[PDB]
Every structure is written in C-alpha cells, then in structure tokens.
Amino acid sequence: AVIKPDMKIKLRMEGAVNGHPFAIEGVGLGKPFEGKQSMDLKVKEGGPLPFAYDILTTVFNRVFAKYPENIVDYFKQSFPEGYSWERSMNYEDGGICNATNDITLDGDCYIYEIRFDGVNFPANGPVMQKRTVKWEPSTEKLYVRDGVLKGDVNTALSLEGGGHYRCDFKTTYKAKKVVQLPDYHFVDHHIEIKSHDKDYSNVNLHEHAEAHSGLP
Amino acid sequence: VIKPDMKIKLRMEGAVNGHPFAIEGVGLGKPFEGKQSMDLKVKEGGPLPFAYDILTTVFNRVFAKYPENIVDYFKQSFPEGYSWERSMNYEDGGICNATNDITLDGDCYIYEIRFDGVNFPANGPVMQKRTVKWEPSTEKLYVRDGVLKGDVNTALSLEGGGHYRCDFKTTYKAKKVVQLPDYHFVDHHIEIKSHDKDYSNVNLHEHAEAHSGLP
Amino acid sequence: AVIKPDMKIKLRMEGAVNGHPFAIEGVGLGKPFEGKQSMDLKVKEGGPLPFAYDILTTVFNRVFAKYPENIVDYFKQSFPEGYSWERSMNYEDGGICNATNDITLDGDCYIYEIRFDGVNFPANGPVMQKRTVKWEPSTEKLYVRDGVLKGDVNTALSLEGGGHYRCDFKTTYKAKKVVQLPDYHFVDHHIEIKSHDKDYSNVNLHEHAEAHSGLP
Amino acid sequence: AVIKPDMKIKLRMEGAVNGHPFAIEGVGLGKPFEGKQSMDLKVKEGGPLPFAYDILTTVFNRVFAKYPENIVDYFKQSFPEGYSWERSMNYEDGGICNATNDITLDGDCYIYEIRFDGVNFPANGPVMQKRTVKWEPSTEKLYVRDGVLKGDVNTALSLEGGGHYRCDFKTTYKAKKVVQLPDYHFVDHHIEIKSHDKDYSNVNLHEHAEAHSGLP
C-alpha cells in the first residue's frame, strides 16, 4: 503493498490560539520506511500569526517512523483505511493546545484534516512573544490501553536567552480498521524548521523518527 | 448599560474527539441577581455522542450577584464586552478547551463560543453518558498579568454513584481597561432543567453569587 | 457525650523540606462545634527554618469545622476512636509537599502525629525566599470515593507584590472505626498566622471553619 | 579522579507509605563507566510492605550511567564531595511518592541517605493491591534550569494482567561542589527486580543506564 518508499502529504489545518482563528495548508513528501518527511507550509488565514510557530510543528503522521521488525507497526498497518489521532499539549505555564488529525490516503498521498485549539496562553509568555527556538530531540512512550495505541511524551522547546519550555504530550491513536496492537515501545523524534520567512508565512518543516526497544 | 433583564443569544461550534457539532441558544437572565436560563438546539453533528454536561458550563460571569464589597470585573467591561478562554481538565485525561468572545447589542449578550475535547476515553462517563449533574461550585478569582482568572475544582455526579472531577482554569480578558478586583469567590449552581431524549433540546439554568469567603 | 465543646490540641510534626530535616511541637485550644481553633507552635529541630512557614500551617483537624444538622459530620462521629488523614499539596512551581496526620484522643485532648515532606522547591521561589504573606480563605470540596472521604481545594498564598501562588490540595480522610459517609458538601476555611516571632520559632495559628452544601 | 571502575554501595532508607512507617537498608556494587549496578536490600522496619515494592526501586545514583564524552558528566564531576537529588513521583491515580537522597563518597563506596513518603494510594489500586510487575524501559530527559540540573521522564509500570500504570517523575539534581553544567541530553534506563522473597524482605535490584544526545 500500500505504502511506497516515497509518499507525499497534503494537509489543511484550521485552528485558533487564545481565540485567534487561523488556517494553514501544507504540501510535502516523506519516505515513511526511514522515518523522514519534509513539508512546506503556507498560512492562509489569520496571518501574521501572533504566536510561536513551534507550538504547531508537531501537529503537522507516525508512519514516518523507522520501525524495526521487532516492533509491530500500528500505523503502516492502518492503511489504506488510515487512522485518526487526538492530542493534548500541556505547557508548564498552563498554555494548552488540543488538536485532532484525521488522516486518509489518496494514491500515494496522505491527507490530513487537522483541528487545533490553544487556550490560556499568557500574554507575556514565551509563546505569545515568540521566544522559542527549537524542539529538542524527543522520545515518545507508546503503550496500549483499552484497545487503542497511546503516546506520552514530556519534552521542551529551547528558549531564546537560555533554558527550556516544557510540554506534556498525551496522544491517543485510533485506527479505522481492526489492527494488531503492539508492545510498550518508544519513538525517538527530531523535528526541525529548516527554513522560514520573517512572519512564518512560509515554513520548511522536517521530521525524523525511529522506533526502538529501549536499552538493549 | 446593563438592564435588570438582559437577553442572550449564542452559537457554539466545536468537536469532541474529532467529531464535529454545532449548537445555538437563546435566553435571558438577571445579571444583578446572578440568574440566567436558556434554550439550546443542536444544529450539526447530532445526536451528540457525549454527555451534555461537559459543554453546559461553557454556555457569562456577568450573571453573578455581586456585592459592593467586591469589584465587578464583568459588568465593568460593558458595553465593550470581554473574552474568556478555559481548560476543563477531567481526571481521566479528557481535556476540553473553550473560548468565548462576548459582545453586547442593546439588551442581548451575544456569544461566539469554541469548544474542543480530546483524549476522552470510549469507556468513560462522558462517552457512555454516565453524567447526572454538576455539583454546586465555588470559583477562586485572582488577578494575574493584568487580567482576571478563575480556578475551580468540581465534579459530576455519576449515574451509579460517585463523582467525576474536572479542573477549571479560566482566563477572563476585558476589552477596555477596567478596575481589577481582589481575591474573591463566586458560588455556582448549574442545572439542566429540561431536555429531550437525545439532548437535541436543552433548557439551562444557572444561579451565581459572589462572596469574600468565610467572614 | 463524646467530644466536649472545649477540647485541647497537642501535637508533634516531624518532616523535611528539600531534604533538610526539622521538627515542630505545638499545643492549642478550640471548640469543634463552633469550628474555631487556635494553637501555639514551637520549632524544636532544624531551626531557624529556611523555608516559608505558611506551607505547614495547613497541616496543623477537620474536627474543627461547624457542621449543620442536615450534613453528616464524618469527623466528630469517628471519635473516640479517631481518624487519620493523608494529603498532597502541589505548588504551581513544581514544589510538592506530602503530609500525613494520625489523630487520636486522650480524654479531652487530640494528639497529632504528623509527618511532612516537601520536595523540589526552587531556590528563587516564594517558599525558599519566604515571600509568602498568607493563605487566602478557601472552600474545600468533599465527596466520597471508594469508601473513604476526600477533599480537594485549590487555594493560593498571598505574595509580596499582591501576586498569588496557587496550590492544589488533595486530602484523603480515613476513620478508624466504621462511620456513616456524607454527601457532596463544602467546608469553608480561613487560616492565618495571628502572631509570630522573627524566624518563626514561635507561631500563633488560628482557623475558623464551617461546612455548607453550596448554592441552594 | 578517586572514583574507580568498580565501586560499592551502602544505603539506608527511612520512609512511610500512606502513613505506615518502614525502613530498609541495602548493599551493592556497580561500574559507573558502564552504567550497571546491583544491590541487595533488606527491610528492617515496617513489617512486610503492604505496598508494591516497585515504587521504591527507583529511589535506590545517576553516576551509574554510561556517558559519551561529548556530554558533560555532571555526576562524576561532583565527587568526592558528592551530590544531592530530590524527586516527586506522580502516579496517574493520584498517589504521589516524594523522595530525597543525600549521596556521599567514602573511599570506594557510595553512601546514600534516603527518605521516602508516598500518600493517597487507594486500596483498590495497583500499588496497594500489589499488582505491579516491573518498570518498563524509560528515557530520561535532563536539562539545566536556574543553575541546577533537572530530570524529567514520565514512564509506566507494567501491570499484572498486561495493563500499564504511568508515573510522572520530576527530579532535581544538585551537586555539592560547583561543577560544569551540561546541555539538554538523555539517559536510557532499564531497572529490574531480579530475585526476592515472598514478601520482598530481600530484593536484588539492577539498573543499566546509558546517556545520549537523542536522535541525530
């Protein structure tokens, strides 16, 4: 087969941050069997965006994750039917973004229908003042609970004058057909904005994900 | 600016676990007595697959009996109005984000509401509609970074007994510069007075009073 | 019956904050059916205390709470056998205090055996720099869960510049004998340090408490 | 260095869980440059522990962690003076265990002074009903904040019937001499209970730990 080594992405996200509506679309490609993808994103509504753009980058597929044969792929097995995922992003200052993404497949393109709502971000915080720099490398903790796969991560965004800005990830992954569940495992993540213009109306995003078994 | 009897109209667009819906309502209240009532119809996404109680608390702090010992942040924001955001954190990890931009037009308050719930479990009292009602509440309001905040710890009484807890974190933003208040409280009691089988029609009621704590 | 209108309190609390041991003993008086109490506390070890004294004042009996006859009092009913209570105080900067109190009766005096452990308090926070002023009045939410009574409340400490420092209280109330459980209700709290010496080696504490069922 | 390839450990921990005191001591050894260490623990007070022994195995030194040399060793740099660490474990059912560890060095053996207090564990939970199996492999994210080193991982316990029980770890590591601080990095952990008596009066503990920079 369903997934070829080279696949494309088309997406469209509609959201709001602190009661600011905005919309972003993006197009990209990514070899999912090596866990790498890249995309180009354009703001279509709500520009210029008044919030730190990184709070969205991780909302922009777990099929781009290098899986070894030891661990069962929940994601590549869900296609061509696809899956849906929900997430709550809890930032240490109380800023909360909840997002959903319904991903489907069309030939060799994964199509995303993404929702995003971020509230309670403080006016003087590093998100509303765009003082973030980068997401650090990450390791996600995936475990099964009540028939579906879940994702838990606590990571941070690197801040401008030094220090880190921490966020707690709680992801629920739901397949659309009945699929085989995996054991407790991990995904190492590294997401980068490799190029952008001034107001982040055009952004180049890059991911790199691999799944592993812990300390061997 | 505020009549003793004020009208009310709203539209809420939202989703729960990625399942969209839309709700509108009209109603009126007495802001100087802290009471309101409204009638709500679902327009899209019906019949809703979640317990109606989770969004019923999103449906104006202006409806709150304020004494002169406490500064009213809400009636002071008017006629320009205010906006409020909220996180409703349920103890099983289901989290609801809500937004409300409130404006005034004559004697009717108009609300533009957003509502998003994620990570709610299939087997929870919200996906199985095991909620009965929200218990009486007391809100803790304090100033932070120029704006007013609201924190409560409350619960839903469940069908077979017991309670289901939610953490409220509310930020209230006025649209003009107004006088900030001291640490105070607002006592809440929200009841759904009437509804049809699939909660396509809902009659809401709320009584709200403010206090300075135990005197 | 059992409990008289005027009862006395004598206690000893042993604890540590960020790994530094200390101990306090205290004696006091109160009227449980009028919900008001007062006691005098003396530091015995670890003095002078290098942390804000306000964090332990909420550990120093819900027997002192005015109950109406329409609400079932769980606390005065569990005497003369007594009860024990458990509690976690999560402070918004990540400092967390764990405390326990085993309460017994000896004639007309309640004896408290308190353990208290606070960890992860940051050096630059209002607790390590003793920038606290007061606890604001509180309303605790009491409900039964799994056979025991519990109490949740979020309060704040009044700071130097009018700011506020919020903490989440999670208390488990366990009686020693079998008593009738109450319905969902509230208890209103007001605790203030009504005197003290310079480094808080001597503290006069007061609390007034009444229980209610909310807005009728 | 005066830290050798083979060092030994001796410790004593005094604590309580839900208000019931206990104390256990242990002796063991390890190799800090390969990240492995074993110990034997004997309960000395507290009867037979009515709680899952797994909750404390994680309180029983990050010097036993394989560091690559382009990551700065914060721990081996704090010796022979030693370091202290504080931590607050948060379990998803609301039970919280707080622990402190004052680590010292004496020749070739590390001495720990451990205090531990957990509270609010419910009777019907996996800790009070001894339904834990083991800790899963975990990935710890360590970062500097306000001059001190921090440790964030939230992980889970694999349960009896296949389920999972997650915990939020918040660790503060404070050295006792001024040492060179590191960049955001990781420590991979795998801790196991290798042998025990029927009531865990004797427990053999093992942990393997290696440090990494994340996904390159």
Coordinates of C-alpha atoms in Angstrom, one line a residue, chain B residues 91 135-138 140 142-144 151-155 162-165 167-169 183 185 187-189 207-209 211-215, chain C residues 92 136-139 141 143-145 150 152-156 162-164 166 168-169 184 186 188-190 208-210 212-216:
Chain B
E91 CA -9.4 13.4 35.9
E135 CA -22.4 19.9 41.7
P136 CA -22.6 23.4 43.3
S137 CA -19.3 25.2 42.8
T138 CA -17.2 28.0 44.3
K140 CA -11.5 31.4 43.1
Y142 CA -7.5 36.4 41.3
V143 CA -5.5 38.8 39.2
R144 CA -2.5 37.7 37.2
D151 CA -10.0 28.4 39.2
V152 CA -12.4 25.7 40.4
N153 CA -12.3 22.2 41.3
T154 CA -15.7 20.5 40.7
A155 CA -17.2 17.2 39.8
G162 CA -19.7 8.6 42.8
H163 CA -18.3 11.7 41.3
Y164 CA -16.2 12.7 38.2
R165 CA -13.8 15.6 38.7
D167 CA -10.1 21.1 36.9
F168 CA -11.2 24.6 35.6
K169 CA -8.5 27.1 34.6
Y183 CA -9.1 37.7 45.6
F185 CA -15.1 33.8 45.1
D187 CA -20.6 30.3 44.1
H188 CA -22.2 28.3 41.2
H189 CA -25.0 26.0 40.7
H207 CA -27.5 30.8 39.8
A208 CA -24.3 32.6 40.7
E209 CA -23.3 34.6 43.7
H211 CA -18.5 36.3 48.2
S212 CA -15.4 37.3 50.1
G213 CA -15.0 33.8 51.7
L214 CA -15.7 32.9 55.3
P215 CA -16.2 36.2 57.1
Chain C
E92 CA 2.4 25.6 40.8
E136 CA -6.5 33.2 51.3
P137 CA -9.8 31.9 52.5
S138 CA -10.7 28.5 50.9
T139 CA -13.6 26.4 50.1
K141 CA -14.8 20.2 48.1
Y143 CA -17.1 13.8 48.4
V144 CA -16.9 10.1 49.0
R145 CA -14.8 7.9 46.8
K150 CA -11.8 13.0 50.2
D152 CA -10.0 18.8 47.0
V153 CA -9.4 22.5 47.1
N154 CA -7.2 24.9 45.1
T155 CA -6.0 27.9 47.1
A156 CA -3.2 30.4 46.8
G162 CA 0.0 41.3 45.6
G163 CA 0.7 38.3 43.4
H164 CA -0.7 34.8 44.1
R166 CA -1.6 28.6 43.8
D168 CA -3.7 22.0 44.7
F169 CA -4.7 20.2 48.0
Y184 CA -21.1 16.0 48.5
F186 CA -18.1 22.0 51.2
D188 CA -15.1 27.0 54.3
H189 CA -11.6 27.7 55.6
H190 CA -9.7 30.7 56.9
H208 CA -12.3 29.2 61.5
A209 CA -14.2 26.6 59.6
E210 CA -17.8 26.0 58.7
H212 CA -22.0 24.0 53.8
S213 CA -23.7 22.4 50.8
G214 CA -23.2 25.3 48.4
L215 CA -25.7 27.4 46.5
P216 CA -29.3 26.1 47.1

